[PDB]
Design a protein around this ligand. Sequence first.
Ligand SMILES: N[C@@H](Cn1c2c(c(=O)[nH]c1=O)CCC2)C(=O)O
Ligand SMILES: N[C@@H](Cn1c2c(c(=O)[nH]c1=O)CCC2)C(=O)O
Lengths: 259, 259
Amino acid sequence: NKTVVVTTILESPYVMMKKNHEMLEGNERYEGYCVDLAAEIAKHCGFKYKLTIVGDGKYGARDADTKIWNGMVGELVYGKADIAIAPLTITLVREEVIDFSKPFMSLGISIMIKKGTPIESAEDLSKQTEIAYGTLDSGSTKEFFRRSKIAVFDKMWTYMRSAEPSVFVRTTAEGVARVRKSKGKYAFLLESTMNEYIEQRKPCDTMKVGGNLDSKGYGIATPKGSSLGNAVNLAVLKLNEQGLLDKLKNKWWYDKGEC
Amino acid sequence: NKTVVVTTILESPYVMMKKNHEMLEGNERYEGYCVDLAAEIAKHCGFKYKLTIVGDGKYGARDADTKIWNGMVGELVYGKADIAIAPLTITLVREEVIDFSKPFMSLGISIMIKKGTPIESAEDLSKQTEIAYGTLDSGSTKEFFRRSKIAVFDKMWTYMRSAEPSVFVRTTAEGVARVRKSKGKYAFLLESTMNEYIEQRKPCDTMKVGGNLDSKGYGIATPKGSSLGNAVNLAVLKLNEQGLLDKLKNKWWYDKGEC
Ligand SMILES: N[C@@H](Cn1c2c(c(=O)[nH]c1=O)CCC2)C(=O)O
Ligand SMILES: N[C@@H](Cn1c2c(c(=O)[nH]c1=O)CCC2)C(=O)O
């Protein structure tokens, strides 16, 4: 009856503006993993959709003061969009306010260094200060450290929230650029699948080291009680079971790898 | 109000009989990953429970003809249990008849060989016959090959269902024993986490080879429309975020690894 409003975010290689996008219109000006994923889900759920880029360019966090949800989560919570299709992490605080399909991608927080950086693990970073390190300000990664009770991760958090100048960045591209220009003096803590993607991008000067600090997954989100919830969940399971999600990952990560 | 009836299955190291269990009673008779997980979930959701072993010793499949569900899924579907806590794979067909919490453990189908077997991937396997290979005669792994349309997995499936003598086994233990006693002439297709578990068990003559064929997860299951659903799902997320699920895996997989 109505065109589904999808909220997503400009994050390579999930959703990106096609080259010379000015000559394009609607959904055709975007390309990426979640762009392809959106098409598949729509086709399987039988619905027309419109891709929109989240107004504040954020994922989703609740302000402790105003208790207001921002980012894509907020878009769904306050009814500005019908569904969110992006690298959105399934978390307890978010699951309490919105619904998540089963994960369409598995991942965990990882460490990105400039090749050559004498860092092999989180503990390595924790017991040193020569090499600074941070995370995306805002996001599930930052929250992980902020809420963790585990010795190593709590030590890291006390360091990061106190660091000066700030060790946090506004976007992934900023973290990546910061690592690249810090001559091995800055390590970026980000989600493994993004870490892996950048490792295959010129100038091929970064790499993921160590194991993941945790294990989470990205899920398709819908506002609570949404009628699309059930169908989308089944669509995600179906797509994964047919190997489609694996192919989409290959296509955007390695088929187009530049290293 | 009522003691929650938990249905689980004897599958090491998820649920196992303690030494001299005849000396013990109730839940104290069992130990393992799911036993610990069950206790953690119950504590967080605030309910008393009784661990029970699924009658037919199966995970859950629908009979094509009678369309009746067996195993743990069947116990939930037909109201014989309130919740299922075990290495139960989240699949589309199952999600259509029961509810699953988000995954508490990630996995994928993998290849188990006796040390020295000249096999490294599903493709090697599919391109030969001297080395027999199969899976459990029941479960998601078997179902994966049965419904797969990917050339490699289809070829493998056509071989397995035609194979004589039968390459399917009644249980993991049998799959392992067959691998262990086949002089390298039999490979077992099983879920990664079990493969990894057995690789750390004496005689230490088996190992995992190649990447996983797929990417899936185990979830706590409840009957569709169960009131326990929400709280359980939230509990799994919390346990994961606090890092308890990772601790339980280390404890049952590596802390007591015998190799
Ligand atoms: N997925 C997270 C957002 N997010 C993302 C990346 C990261 O490194 N850290 C992080 O928190 C890379 C892409 C998105 C969320 O939902 O908050
Ligand atoms: N997890 C599956 C059951 N199962 C299991 C293993 C396997 O190798 N294959 C399989 O289908 C080892 C652990 C249990 C299900 O839910 O049906």
